[PDB]
């Protein structure tokens, strides 16, 4: 948890989130349900698609081994060929193993960052009209119906519209 | 009324290794190493190989009496030879 | 034996003939395409 979102203040994943990596859950008088964030998921798909494609192209021109025959009087020459092919394979094995380990750390941390950005995007948009419960959820001080929830999901919350109603409930 | 931010999870058990953590469960993973072979010496691009068998390269070229089946060979993709 | 795959790596035998993927000595090479799996609360 480099960014503290996955396994951090959001301690559990969602099994009902089936149409995207990341998204929202809401619950009001009308009902409740999940909704994947397609835009953030698509951007994540772009990095992983390019990250793997870049991996293939780099080791595209890896060293290739060719069999050779040497007589019993060419022990030194045969040893050179043996140590060259073994040495090159050891170098390329290290590079392939290291790249996978380094990218796995990068990929898991990249996925961690996107939730923190998504969590902060909603928080900075509902500045004062909600409570920050600290477990990844926000509690509204006003009535937020499906049209209001959908505005929060697509980044079009009308803070001045609910500014007056929220503060009356917040104060008392 | 509440809204929450959360992340996808499933019943996967695929495990990957990171720079400083081992056996990390991930929702989806891809293995990019091939470890399976049919175990048979097939033809390459539809061109059968040249099977010398018990006969050697010098024996085939010199025309060894025990390599009479190699006195005329067609095009080959690769040559198959024994260690001894 | 023969190799029938689309993956870019293999560890069967260093000596290969034809259009073959790149040989490495690693036992496994698994990339994580998805995020970490955390059990439901």
């Amino acid at each position: 948890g480099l960014f503290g979102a996955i396994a951090g203040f959001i301690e559990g994943g969602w099994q009902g989130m089936v149409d995207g990596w990341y998204g929202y859950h809401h619950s009001n008088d009308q009902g409740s349900g999940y909704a994947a964030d397609k835009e953030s998921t698509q951007k994540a798909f772009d990095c992983i698609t390019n990250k793997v494609n870049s991996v293939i192209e780099k080791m595209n021109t890896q060293f290739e081994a060719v069999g050779k025959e040497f007589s019993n009087l060419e022990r030194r020459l045969e040893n050179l060929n043996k140590k060259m092919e073994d040495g090159f394979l050891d170098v390329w094995t290290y590079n392939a193993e290291l790249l996978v380990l380094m990218e796995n750390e990068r990929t898991l941390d990249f996925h961690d960052s996107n939730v923190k950005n998504l969590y902060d995007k909603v928080r900075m948009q509902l500045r004062d009209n909600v409570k920050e419960l600290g477990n990844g959820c926000f509690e509204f001080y006003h009535k937020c119906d499906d049209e209001c929830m959908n505005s929060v999901k697509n980044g079009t919350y009308d803070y001045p519209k609910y500014e007056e109603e929220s503060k009356l409930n917040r104060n008392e | 009324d509440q809204i929450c931010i959360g992340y996808h999870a499933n019943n996967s058990t695929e495990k990957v290794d990171t720079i400083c953590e081992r056996n990390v469960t991930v929702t989806h993973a891809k293995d990019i190493l091939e470890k399976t072979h049919n175990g048979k010496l097939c033809k390459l691009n539809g061109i059968p190989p040249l099977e010398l068998g018990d006969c050697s390269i010098a024996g085939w070229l010199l025309g060894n009496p025990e390599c009479d089946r190699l006195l005329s060979v067609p095009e080959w993709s690769y040559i198959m030879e024994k260690e001894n | 034996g023969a190799i029938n795959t689309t993956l870019p790596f293999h560890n069967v035998h260093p000596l290969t003939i034809g259009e073959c993927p790149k040989y490495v000595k690693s036992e496994k090479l698994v990339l994580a395409t998805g995020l970490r799996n955390v059990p439901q609360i």
Epitope: V18, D19, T41 | H8, H28 | -
Partner: antibody, heavy 120, light 108 residues
């Protein structure tokens, strides 16, 4: 350089099923949603259904609900379509179309398959 | 379910004539999600225009289109010998993903 390869032409009889495949190249794993669009000769193209890239969620048109089953295997990056209970006027050319994104919604068909002709 | 009505139907032209194809929608297409495809018989359809205002990659400059609401159009300033096929318009802003009637271009 992305191409979609489908199965061959098939002939069937009413009451049977069809299994049309569509394998996509250009990458290790499929990252774009694939849908199925058919064109009956003398009629226009119709949308049958589609499958999301990684999560495998499937959406079907109300006309073909209960008769079409679209499945994909992540190992082979192939998409299959299974149309059951064949009847008259099910003769058409089936194309597999690749969406511009990972999801069916708000995405257009970047590329199309060459097409398979199925007769009942 | 948005039904798309393509008006011209048949449009016989010669290389050089301006080609204007009109696609009409029963109800407004959200976010102007409409695309145009070229489907020569015996070949897989190819994407010409997506979003009603954006040209697809590799498409020659002569292909362009514009529109909004329920009215969309495709314009080909200069007709070439390869511009004779059936042209469809789809809307991808609604769930059913409906398709247009299609218009074949003939040789005068």
């Amino acid at each position: 350089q992305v191409q979609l390869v489908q199965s061959g032409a098939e002939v069937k009889k009413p009451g049977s099923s069809v299994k049309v495949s569509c394998k996509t190249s250009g990458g290790i794993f499929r990252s774009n949603a694939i849908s199925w669009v058919r064109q009956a000769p003398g009629q226009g193209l119709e949308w049958m259904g589609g499958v999301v890239a990684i999560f495998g969620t499937t959406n079907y048109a109300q006309n073909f609900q209960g008769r079409v089953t679209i499945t994909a295997d992540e190992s082979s990056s192939t998409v299959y379509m299974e149309l059951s209970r064949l009847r008259s006027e099910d003769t058409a050319v089936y194309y597999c179309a690749r969406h511009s994104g990972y999801h069916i919604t708000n995405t257009f068909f970047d590329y199309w398959g060459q097409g398979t002709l199925v007769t009942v | 379910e948005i039904v798309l009505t393509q008006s011209p139907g048949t449009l016989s032209l010669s290389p050089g004539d301006r080609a204007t194809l009109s696609c009409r929608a029963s109800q407004s297409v959200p976010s102007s999600y409409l695309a145009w495809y070229r489907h020569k018989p015996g070949q897989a359809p190819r994407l010409l225009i997506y979003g009603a205002s954006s040209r697809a990659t590799g498409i020659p400059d002569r292909f362009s289109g514009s529109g909004s609401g329920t009215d969309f159009s495709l314009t080909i300033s200069r007709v070439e010998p390869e511009d004779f096929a059936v042209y469809y318009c789809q809307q991808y802003g609604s769930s059913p993903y409906t398709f247009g009637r299609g218009t074949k271009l003939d040789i005068k």
